[PDB]
Ligand binder design. Sequence first.
Ligand SMILES: [Fe+3]
Ligand SMILES: [O+]
Ligand SMILES: [O+]
Ligand SMILES: [O+]
Ligand SMILES: [O+]
Length: 54
Amino acid sequence: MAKWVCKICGYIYDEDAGDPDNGISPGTKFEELPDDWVCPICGAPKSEFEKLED
Ligand SMILES: [Fe+3]
Ligand SMILES: [O+]
Ligand SMILES: [O+]
Ligand SMILES: [O+]
Ligand SMILES: [O+]
């Protein structure tokens, strides 16, 4: 699945890993994250992520 980088701090949201400590099971696509999910390291909103693909 896809990976998305937090442009502020460099954390990688990996769809394969999810973010289970913050309520997100493995296999959850970035588009399916709740509107108020934020980067677990720096607190940046979803707007500040970029998908790692051309
Ligand atoms: Fe971040
Ligand atoms: O990716
Ligand atoms: O995980
Ligand atoms: O899941
Ligand atoms: O936002």
